[PDB]
Amino acid sequence: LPITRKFYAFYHAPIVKFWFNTLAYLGFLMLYTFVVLVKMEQLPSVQEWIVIAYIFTYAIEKVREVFMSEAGKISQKIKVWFSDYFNVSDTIAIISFFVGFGLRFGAKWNYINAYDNHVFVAGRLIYCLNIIFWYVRLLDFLAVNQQAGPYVMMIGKMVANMFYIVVI
Amino acid sequence: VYLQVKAISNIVWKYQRYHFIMAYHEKPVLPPPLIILSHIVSLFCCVCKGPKLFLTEEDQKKLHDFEEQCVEMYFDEKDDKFNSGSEERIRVTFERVEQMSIQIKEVGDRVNYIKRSLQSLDS
Amino acid sequence: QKSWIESTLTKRECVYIIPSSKDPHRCLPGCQICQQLVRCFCGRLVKQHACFTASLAMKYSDVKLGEHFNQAIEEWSVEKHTEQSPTDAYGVINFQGGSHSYRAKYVRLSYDTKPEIILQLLLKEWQMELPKLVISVHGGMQKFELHPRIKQLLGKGLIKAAVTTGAWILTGGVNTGVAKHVGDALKEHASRSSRKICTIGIAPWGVIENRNDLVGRDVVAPYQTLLNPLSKLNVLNNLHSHFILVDDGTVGKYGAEVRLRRELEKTINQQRIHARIGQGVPVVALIFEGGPNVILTVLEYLQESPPVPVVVCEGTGRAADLLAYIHKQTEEGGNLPDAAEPDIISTIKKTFNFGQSEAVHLFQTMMECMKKKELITVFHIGSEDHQDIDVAILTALLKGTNASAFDQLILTLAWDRVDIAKNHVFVYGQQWLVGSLEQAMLDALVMDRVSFVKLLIENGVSMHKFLTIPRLEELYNTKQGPTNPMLFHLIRDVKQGNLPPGYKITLIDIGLVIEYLMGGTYRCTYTRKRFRLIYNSLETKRFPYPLNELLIWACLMKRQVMARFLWQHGEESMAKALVACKIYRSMAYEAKQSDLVDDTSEELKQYSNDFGQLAVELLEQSFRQDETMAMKLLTYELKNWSNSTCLKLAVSSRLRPFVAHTCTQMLLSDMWMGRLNMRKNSWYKVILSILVPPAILMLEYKTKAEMSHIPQSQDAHQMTMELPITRKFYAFYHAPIVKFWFNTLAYLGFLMLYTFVVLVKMEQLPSVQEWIVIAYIFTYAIEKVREVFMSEAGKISQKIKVWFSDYFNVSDTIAIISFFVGFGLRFGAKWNYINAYDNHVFVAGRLIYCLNIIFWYVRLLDFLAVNQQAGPYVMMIGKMVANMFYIVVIMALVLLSFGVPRKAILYPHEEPSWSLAKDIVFHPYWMIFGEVYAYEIDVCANDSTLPTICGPGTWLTPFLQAVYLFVQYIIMVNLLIAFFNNVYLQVKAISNIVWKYQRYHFIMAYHEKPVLPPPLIILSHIVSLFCCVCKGPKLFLTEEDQKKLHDFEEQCVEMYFDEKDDKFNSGSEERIRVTFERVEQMSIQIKEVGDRVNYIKRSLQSLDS
Ligand SMILES: CCCCCCCC/C=C/CCCCCCCC(=O)O[C@@H](COC(=O)CCCCCCCCCCCCCCC)COP(=O)([O-])OCC[N+](C)(C)C
Ligand SMILES: CCCCCCCC/C=C/CCCCCCCC(=O)O[C@@H](COC(=O)CCCCCCCCCCCCCCC)COP(=O)([O-])OCC[N+](C)(C)C
Ligand SMILES: CCCCCCCC/C=C/CCCCCCCC(=O)O[C@@H](COC(=O)CCCCCCCCCCCCCCC)COP(=O)([O-])OCC[N+](C)(C)C
Ligand SMILES: CCCCCCCC/C=C/CCCCCCCC(=O)O[C@@H](COC(=O)CCCCCCCCCCCCCCC)COP(=O)([O-])OCC[N+](C)(C)C
Ligand SMILES: CCCCCCCC/C=C\CCCCCCCC(=O)O[C@@H](COC(=O)CCCCCCCCCCCCCCC)COP(=O)([O-])OCC[N+](C)(C)C
Ligand SMILES: CCCCCCCC/C=C\CCCCCCCC(=O)O[C@@H](COC(=O)CCCCCCCCCCCCCCC)COP(=O)([O-])OCC[N+](C)(C)C
Ligand SMILES: CCCCCCCC/C=C\CCCCCCCC(=O)O[C@@H](COC(=O)CCCCCCCCCCCCCCC)COP(=O)([O-])OCC[N+](C)(C)C
Ligand SMILES: CCCCCCCC/C=C\CCCCCCCC(=O)O[C@@H](COC(=O)CCCCCCCCCCCCCCC)COP(=O)([O-])OCC[N+](C)(C)C
Ligand SMILES: CCCCCCCC/C=C\CCCCCCCC(=O)O[C@@H](COC(=O)CCCCCCCCCCCCCCC)COP(=O)([O-])OCC[N+](C)(C)C
Ligand SMILES: CCCCCCCC/C=C\CCCCCCCC(=O)O[C@@H](COC(=O)CCCCCCCCCCCCCCC)COP(=O)([O-])OCC[N+](C)(C)C
Ligand SMILES: CCCCCCCC/C=C\CCCCCCCC(=O)O[C@@H](COC(=O)CCCCCCCCCCCCCCC)COP(=O)([O-])OCC[N+](C)(C)C
Ligand SMILES: CCCCCCCC/C=C\CCCCCCCC(=O)O[C@@H](COC(=O)CCCCCCCCCCCCCCC)COP(=O)([O-])OCC[N+](C)(C)C
């Protein structure tokens, strides 16, 4: 096994792509947690820019996966991908984020004290609610473990089954 | 409901592991901030131009034979599991005791008519 | 050519074109028909020759102008006038038939191929296992059918004989005779022997339906199996697996097999049946339902040098029923009865239409056959003769061939047929040489022939005399049996990491492997002085207990069925089972730590647990007979197994069912007591007596007899000879139960003081209470160092590694280290400020104390774990923490998913700070524990306690909190309840076993712990140390008690096997099947009597008139 072949073997292994995406995702959440918890100025901070870059490119990556799936028919490719819980949530997460960035970034500051401008506030509050989607997607990463993964599947099944007791 | 839900959830977890692992064979190397290079580059290189199992012909031979051998074992172990159960041995025993119970009596009649011999033969 | 066949084996195409016999058929002009009808004496019409050389002979007129001096028309020879050229067909035919293709093979070799090339063709080119037998069936062709009795049986034996012996069945192959009956017998026993019987049809390339469909270089020709009507031609019988078609001559002529097939019958015999064995491969012949050239062939095989014996199954047809009676009218090897010309040659004239023109010629062939009837076995059907011919075929090779019984035995050994040898070789009056049965034992062990080892031990081989050093050396070094590749991997890891070229293994190296596997201080007999000296010098060269040495052999060679057998022989059965468990367990470990391919770590871990269960089951058997003698079995020194005990061996293998067995637990409880009868006493009189020493003199102690089953110290067993006053104090303070409460009271008094110290204000100098606390922990710490550096295993790095495997020793280590950091800061701190807590070094010291004390309250769970009820629950708590981990990880994520939005919405004007980390986790955690923070939920309400937080978006946080608590309480808390409810019983069960198991190490520890507890323990350290400069528990048994105990062990092992045979033979499943089989047998005899009684009816007719 020559030297350069060994790098190929490493970076193209699925286990490596996972931790390589998992570390990037954790670093993504640390920054996006920093952004929502720290005061927000007119222009996005370096942390907020990196967050936007992730979600934009993460979104293109999902469009790649849909339009290259298996079955030729788009209306079948679409219909299967929106059968997974976390792809529905990711779709809501991506769409809601850019509504938020649009309001946050497109808002004109007539008032010097932020939070006088409601369009800005609606943007920031979308961020603070959009981040819930991204912490819950960590359950998808955690679902790679043989012990954890079934319990994640159980939680959704038990919510469905307990519905009528909760209605009462 | 814990045990039945846990059991169904293990099967579903194990099943959805196919689609998850297969996905990471077509995902780019680079992660989603730096993934754009793997998008731009890969796209551009395509304009400049799934996983398969590869088997030698001898390996195809030995694999097709392996499949045939194991199907044969599968039917043999069923016939020998059914023919060796107690329920099947009771009924073949039942039917064979039914048959004998005729022949036992039938011999019983013949031997009772070889008694007719004893009378005629001795005088 | 890319093929050995294409470059070696040949065709025989008739280049020379002899016109047919002489005469044209019809059709007056003789130029069209002299070409067209007139075939070759080759045997085909003229244009089929296609002679690459003489293709233009037919266009002219033909090869070889007509007249040619009639003599020279027979001058055509298969030898001369036939161009040897490539094969042109060798491949894989199939047979669309009884639910399988039933594939096969053909080479289509010429005819005059050398005899060796077949053997090379059969073994490497076709990849066939060399057989242990060759059945060469013969007979006539195109017969209808047999009696439905005989038909079913002939197969049943023919199959059985061939499958049990890896035999080849040589047939003609063509489905018009002998082959038919072979094949029809195969399908009645197919998919049971379809991979052990390699039948071979050595048929010609003449008489066959589609010769041209068989053609094709390396083809998969889909050959038919439909009887092509309107013809006489024959088909290859489908149920054969190999064919050697013989290209010669033509269609119709079928005589070119005797030259080749016979040579194969001669060349297989010159092969050696096995490596360890020197006898040649046998050849047998089963003639059923034969003809005139068979009777020639029978005598041609008997007259041969050496003779090939013959079987004759009477009633199949003419030659069988004939010979069966024609070699019945004779002396044993001599002359015929009163002149037999009339009746013998009568049937020879009736069966074969002769009329004395060929009726003497057969009778002359008969009278030569009867010169050797000892080789003509005959299967007397009707009178259950030799039971389903397999005996009759195989015993024919063991009937008279002046072969010694040593050769009759090896042949059964290679066949793996014990029933044959015991019933036909170990017959009354049989006589043996001195080491013939020894050489047969060496072979059976090297070949893993377990059932022949039994036959030879019974019949009188003695392992005490058989087994020697050089023999036992060989048994390790043989590559002539089911070896273990991993043994070398363990040898080269103990030698130096290297190996010489071949390296014939030595027994000192085996001794070194066992010590590595058995571990600890195990020292093997093979690494001892006397063995190391005598082996250098290589009764002295025997072994006193040879089946201990072969059990080790069989277990290191991964020969389990031989190990189980050898285990049942000899003495010390429970110990041997526990040694085997440890050997396999350690082998399984190093297999799990080697990059080899066949991991064999579940095969070895399963073999370990098989012997593990045997030891447990023998203990239960012994315990059911006599508890007190069974407890002695756990602790008597073995002296053939490094002076260990059965209990220590089980602990070595981490064998919990043995240690957690109630017998072992009963013994541990008795050792806990010491000399104290804690049935007549109460725990509060012990505590009272630790505080009131003179109350020691009014407890109920135990007699030396009541202590007979209990191991003791040497000093403790000498004070058993009598109970004076001072001996009674010894018995009290050295009992483990007393040392416990004596340390437990001191520990509780230690915590009361250390609780006092942390709760009461702290001055510059430590108080009297704090000094006593420091003294305890210092001396408690030395006590732990004593325990580590005096444990068991010599190697510090193993002593260290085991001690830090216990939860509470890790915590004690952290506790001791953290304490003296705290005392150092507390005591070493200089007070620059008069008000304490201005000096931070002092504070850090005191706060370490206040946190270090948590370790010491939790160590009380270790004391509490001495109770049978409490102790399992303590073990459960740790197991449930491990198992609940991922449910709690999910809860932690739900917490953050709420905490981060809450803080962000409510506190939007924050700068970076570590308080942010607190605030996202703090309130969400306390919500889990019944605190909803009711007046902070809606911060804009009138009753809000956070009115200044009221601002834009804050109306979202009640919705978030409502979702959060639904998920945590309604889902996640109750999932955890459901988790614990459903795993409780299996965790409680595992925790009871672990509690019971760790009770060994706990009770054993208190036999080596000092009497005095950890503040006053220093005296027992200083004194004991100093007294050593001035200079384990064993069971002691008298010689008579050793006798009665060794007999007890033997008795209970015998009961153990008897109760198994009688439990299996008395189950309903076993009685149904023996009933099944006996009803199957009767159902034949009932009908058989039914036929006889129906033929005693034939009497009634004839007798009465
Ligand atoms: C398969 C599933 C995954 C993929 C799904 C992907 C597509 C999903 C959908 C995505 C679109 C979501 C909506 C976008 C925003 C519109 C709403 C809005 O309020 O806009 C505002 C910003 O208007 C602007 O023009 C500034 C924003 C710049 C563009 C950023 C958003 C688009 C990027 C898309 C990136 C994703 C693309 C991914 C790759 C192609 C307008 O309001 P305003 O003018 O600020 O306020 C006026 C009042 N004032 C007086 C106070 C100023
Ligand atoms: C198998 C497991 C169990 C066994 C494990 C056993 C070994 C485990 C390890 C044990 C060692 C743990 C660390 C010791 C303390 C060092 C740290 C420290 O801060 O020290 C301080 C005290 O420095 C002194 O010199 C005064 C302390 C006297 C010695 C007491 C500790 C050693 C005893 C060991 C007894 C155990 C031995 C057991 C028997 C051999 C230094 O700080 P300061 O000078 O005070 O402050 C300076 C600032 N000022 C200006 C404010 C003044
Ligand atoms: C069964 C019983 C329930 C019946 C339901 C009927 C729903 C009817 C809907 C009514 C909404 C209108 C009521 C408020 C009037 C508007 C202005 C106002 O006062 O806003 C108030 C907040 O509230 C909001 O700003 C918006 C609240 C929207 C969510 C309401 C629940 C929607 C349904 C369920 C959603 C879940 C998902 C549903 C689907 C599954 C202002 O309050 P404040 O915080 O004190 O702010 C003032 C102080 N400040 C200026 C400093 C900020
Ligand atoms: C998927 C299931 C859906 C469940 C149903 C839908 C959800 C429930 C729907 C509720 C109706 C919506 C209420 C609108 C009220 C507006 C009034 C206002 O001024 O602002 C209020 C809204 O702002 C808040 O922050 C309070 C929102 C209510 C949270 C309810 C959580 C409990 C969930 C229950 C779930 C169980 C449901 C039971 C079954 C139906 C806050 O008032 P304030 O800050 O004090 O403002 C000052 C006013 N003052 C001056 C008078 C003090
Ligand atoms: C997409 C994938 C990303 C992957 C990560 C790698 C790339 C990104 C890495 C680093 C980018 C850092 C940019 C710094 C910009 C300089 C100025 C600055 O912010 O100074 C700050 C110093 O910095 C901090 O306080 C750190 C803030 C980021 C926290 C998360 C980093 C760790 C995770 C990622 C790394 C470990 C990975 C962990 C996972 C294993 C000081 O605070 P402030 O912000 O100036 O204050 C703003 C106040 N205001 C707004 C009110 C005015
Ligand atoms: C510069 C930075 C330097 C540091 C970088 C590195 C830092 C560390 C990085 C990452 C943290 C994890 C490290 C531990 C991994 C253990 C190994 C393992 O077995 O993993 C498993 C986990 O597989 C997963 O997919 C786990 C997903 C992790 C992310 C989820 C976090 C949840 C947080 C929510 C809670 C809130 C907590 C928030 C705390 C604030 C994979 O193995 P398996 O598939 O299960 O194997 C089973 C099959 N077998 C039996 C055949 C083997
Ligand atoms: C800020 C607040 C805190 C943050 C929230 C914490 C994070 C969120 C927590 C947990 C999320 C768990 C992730 C889902 C796991 C996978 C499930 C899945 O694959 O499908 C499941 C569907 O799923 C459902 O029916 C619902 C899934 C749970 C939704 C819970 C939402 C939270 C609020 C709810 C309460 C609101 C009411 C209270 C309001 C007063 C499958 O279920 P099934 O149909 O039986 O099985 C078929 C599966 N199959 C198709 C694959 C074969
Ligand atoms: C290592 C093994 C140890 C074993 C124990 C035996 C040896 C140890 C036994 C006794 C030592 C007592 C020393 C007394 C010193 C005189 C001064 C004094 O302290 O007066 C106190 C009176 O005394 C108390 O208040 C008792 C304090 C100790 C409580 C624990 C004793 C019971 C446990 C053990 C015995 C039962 C065993 C229980 C288990 C079955 C008054 O208070 P002060 O303390 O003066 O106030 C300090 C205030 N200042 C600091 C702010 C200035
Ligand atoms: C394995 C061994 C590891 C530990 C080794 C030993 C470590 C030794 C550690 C430290 C020695 C420190 C010596 C002094 C250093 C200079 C500072 C000084 O003297 O004074 C300063 C001390 O201020 C502090 O904050 C001191 C904190 C140090 C204690 C840390 C304990 C760590 C042990 C963790 C547990 C480990 C457990 C390990 C086992 C698991 C200030 O004091 P002052 O003059 O009063 O100032 C007044 C200021 N004022 C105006 C605000 C009022
Ligand atoms: C001067 C002083 C005078 C007084 C001195 C004397 C005072 C009293 C001294 C001590 C208190 C205990 C006395 C009761 C003993 C009962 C007898 C018994 O059976 O014990 C068992 C307990 O075995 C142990 O190992 C128990 C450990 C006790 C310490 C744990 C305390 C937990 C405190 C934490 C909670 C906080 C409470 C804190 C309270 C503030 C041993 O028996 P066994 O092994 O289970 O037998 C089973 C096998 N069999 C069936 C064959 C039999
Ligand atoms: C001041 C505070 C209060 C005081 C605390 C109260 C006292 C502390 C309480 C209980 C301690 C119980 C003692 C251990 C019992 C024995 C267990 C054992 O032997 O091994 C167990 C291992 O153990 C573990 O994996 C962890 C053990 C429990 C640690 C709990 C720490 C407390 C905090 C945690 C929560 C923090 C998170 C929350 C933070 C927000 C065995 O488990 P296993 O691997 O399945 O089995 C193999 C066993 N075998 C090897 C022998 C075969
Ligand atoms: C997805 C649906 C689309 C969204 C619309 C429909 C949603 C329902 C209803 C409508 C939305 C709420 C409208 C009413 C409030 C407006 C008035 C207002 O100013 O309120 C507040 C700000 O509020 C905001 O700035 C709005 C933020 C909206 C975030 C998105 C809601 C979540 C939808 C998820 C739905 C999922 C349901 C659950 C899942 C089944 C108060 O501001 P203020 O105090 O007046 O400002 C003065 C500040 N100053 C004093 C500093 C100057």
PDB file of N, CA, C and O in Angstrom, chain C residues 565-587:
ATOM      1  N   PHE C 565     -13.424 -37.683  26.038  1.00  0.00           N
ATOM      2  CA  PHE C 565     -13.265 -39.106  26.275  1.00  0.00           C
ATOM      3  C   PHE C 565     -12.199 -39.353  27.327  1.00  0.00           C
ATOM      4  O   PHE C 565     -12.462 -39.980  28.354  1.00  0.00           O
ATOM      5  N   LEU C 566     -10.998 -38.822  27.101  1.00  0.00           N
ATOM      6  CA  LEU C 566      -9.889 -39.009  28.024  1.00  0.00           C
ATOM      7  C   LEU C 566     -10.209 -38.477  29.412  1.00  0.00           C
ATOM      8  O   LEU C 566      -9.700 -38.988  30.415  1.00  0.00           O
ATOM      9  N   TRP C 567     -11.042 -37.442  29.487  1.00  0.00           N
ATOM     10  CA  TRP C 567     -11.440 -36.887  30.771  1.00  0.00           C
ATOM     11  C   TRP C 567     -12.159 -37.917  31.635  1.00  0.00           C
ATOM     12  O   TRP C 567     -11.910 -38.011  32.841  1.00  0.00           O
ATOM     13  N   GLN C 568     -13.052 -38.695  31.038  1.00  0.00           N
ATOM     14  CA  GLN C 568     -13.822 -39.707  31.746  1.00  0.00           C
ATOM     15  C   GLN C 568     -12.981 -40.853  32.282  1.00  0.00           C
ATOM     16  O   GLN C 568     -13.517 -41.687  33.013  1.00  0.00           O
ATOM     17  N   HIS C 569     -11.709 -40.928  31.924  1.00  0.00           N
ATOM     18  CA  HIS C 569     -10.796 -41.943  32.405  1.00  0.00           C
ATOM     19  C   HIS C 569      -9.831 -41.321  33.399  1.00  0.00           C
ATOM     20  O   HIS C 569      -9.465 -40.150  33.283  1.00  0.00           O
ATOM     21  N   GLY C 570      -9.433 -42.116  34.380  1.00  0.00           N
ATOM     22  CA  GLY C 570      -8.512 -41.663  35.393  1.00  0.00           C
ATOM     23  C   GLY C 570      -9.202 -41.091  36.606  1.00  0.00           C
ATOM     24  O   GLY C 570     -10.381 -41.360  36.852  1.00  0.00           O
ATOM     25  N   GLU C 571      -8.465 -40.289  37.363  1.00  0.00           N
ATOM     26  CA  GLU C 571      -8.931 -39.710  38.608  1.00  0.00           C
ATOM     27  C   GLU C 571      -8.847 -38.195  38.516  1.00  0.00           C
ATOM     28  O   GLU C 571      -8.299 -37.640  37.565  1.00  0.00           O
ATOM     29  N   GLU C 572      -9.415 -37.534  39.525  1.00  0.00           N
ATOM     30  CA  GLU C 572      -9.411 -36.078  39.636  1.00  0.00           C
ATOM     31  C   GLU C 572     -10.207 -35.443  38.500  1.00  0.00           C
ATOM     32  O   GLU C 572      -9.746 -34.524  37.832  1.00  0.00           O
ATOM     33  N   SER C 573     -11.432 -35.920  38.312  1.00  0.00           N
ATOM     34  CA  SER C 573     -12.230 -35.518  37.163  1.00  0.00           C
ATOM     35  C   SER C 573     -12.669 -34.064  37.257  1.00  0.00           C
ATOM     36  O   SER C 573     -12.745 -33.365  36.244  1.00  0.00           O
ATOM     37  N   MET C 574     -12.972 -33.590  38.463  1.00  0.00           N
ATOM     38  CA  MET C 574     -13.415 -32.215  38.627  1.00  0.00           C
ATOM     39  C   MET C 574     -12.258 -31.252  38.417  1.00  0.00           C
ATOM     40  O   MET C 574     -12.422 -30.190  37.810  1.00  0.00           O
ATOM     41  N   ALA C 575     -11.074 -31.622  38.891  1.00  0.00           N
ATOM     42  CA  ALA C 575      -9.890 -30.808  38.673  1.00  0.00           C
ATOM     43  C   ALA C 575      -9.516 -30.730  37.201  1.00  0.00           C
ATOM     44  O   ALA C 575      -9.232 -29.644  36.689  1.00  0.00           O
ATOM     45  N   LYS C 576      -9.486 -31.871  36.513  1.00  0.00           N
ATOM     46  CA  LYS C 576      -9.127 -31.894  35.101  1.00  0.00           C
ATOM     47  C   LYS C 576     -10.066 -31.035  34.271  1.00  0.00           C
ATOM     48  O   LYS C 576      -9.629 -30.341  33.349  1.00  0.00           O
ATOM     49  N   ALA C 577     -11.358 -31.084  34.575  1.00  0.00           N
ATOM     50  CA  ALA C 577     -12.320 -30.239  33.886  1.00  0.00           C
ATOM     51  C   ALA C 577     -12.022 -28.761  34.086  1.00  0.00           C
ATOM     52  O   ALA C 577     -12.182 -27.961  33.162  1.00  0.00           O
ATOM     53  N   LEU C 578     -11.589 -28.377  35.280  1.00  0.00           N
ATOM     54  CA  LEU C 578     -11.281 -26.983  35.560  1.00  0.00           C
ATOM     55  C   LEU C 578      -9.963 -26.531  34.935  1.00  0.00           C
ATOM     56  O   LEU C 578      -9.825 -25.359  34.571  1.00  0.00           O
ATOM     57  N   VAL C 579      -8.980 -27.425  34.819  1.00  0.00           N
ATOM     58  CA  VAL C 579      -7.750 -27.126  34.090  1.00  0.00           C
ATOM     59  C   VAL C 579      -8.033 -26.948  32.608  1.00  0.00           C
ATOM     60  O   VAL C 579      -7.498 -26.041  31.966  1.00  0.00           O
ATOM     61  N   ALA C 580      -8.858 -27.826  32.041  1.00  0.00           N
ATOM     62  CA  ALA C 580      -9.260 -27.706  30.648  1.00  0.00           C
ATOM     63  C   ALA C 580      -9.984 -26.397  30.376  1.00  0.00           C
ATOM     64  O   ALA C 580      -9.758 -25.765  29.339  1.00  0.00           O
ATOM     65  N   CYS C 581     -10.889 -25.997  31.270  1.00  0.00           N
ATOM     66  CA  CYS C 581     -11.548 -24.702  31.146  1.00  0.00           C
ATOM     67  C   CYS C 581     -10.547 -23.562  31.110  1.00  0.00           C
ATOM     68  O   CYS C 581     -10.695 -22.622  30.324  1.00  0.00           O
ATOM     69  N   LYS C 582      -9.533 -23.612  31.963  1.00  0.00           N
ATOM     70  CA  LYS C 582      -8.557 -22.538  32.007  1.00  0.00           C
ATOM     71  C   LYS C 582      -7.654 -22.537  30.779  1.00  0.00           C
ATOM     72  O   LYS C 582      -7.326 -21.470  30.257  1.00  0.00           O
ATOM     73  N   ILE C 583      -7.226 -23.711  30.320  1.00  0.00           N
ATOM     74  CA  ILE C 583      -6.398 -23.799  29.117  1.00  0.00           C
ATOM     75  C   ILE C 583      -7.138 -23.218  27.918  1.00  0.00           C
ATOM     76  O   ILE C 583      -6.607 -22.372  27.194  1.00  0.00           O
ATOM     77  N   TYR C 584      -8.371 -23.665  27.686  1.00  0.00           N
ATOM     78  CA  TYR C 584      -9.124 -23.167  26.543  1.00  0.00           C
ATOM     79  C   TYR C 584      -9.434 -21.677  26.661  1.00  0.00           C
ATOM     80  O   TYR C 584      -9.411 -20.959  25.656  1.00  0.00           O
ATOM     81  N   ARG C 585      -9.756 -21.198  27.863  1.00  0.00           N
ATOM     82  CA  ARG C 585     -10.038 -19.780  28.052  1.00  0.00           C
ATOM     83  C   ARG C 585      -8.837 -18.924  27.688  1.00  0.00           C
ATOM     84  O   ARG C 585      -8.977 -17.891  27.025  1.00  0.00           O
ATOM     85  N   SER C 586      -7.654 -19.325  28.131  1.00  0.00           N
ATOM     86  CA  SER C 586      -6.447 -18.574  27.832  1.00  0.00           C
ATOM     87  C   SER C 586      -6.054 -18.707  26.369  1.00  0.00           C
ATOM     88  O   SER C 586      -5.518 -17.763  25.781  1.00  0.00           O
ATOM     89  N   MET C 587      -6.300 -19.869  25.769  1.00  0.00           N
ATOM     90  CA  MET C 587      -6.092 -20.029  24.335  1.00  0.00           C
ATOM     91  C   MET C 587      -7.045 -19.144  23.547  1.00  0.00           C
ATOM     92  O   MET C 587      -6.653 -18.507  22.566  1.00  0.00           O
TER      93      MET C 587
END
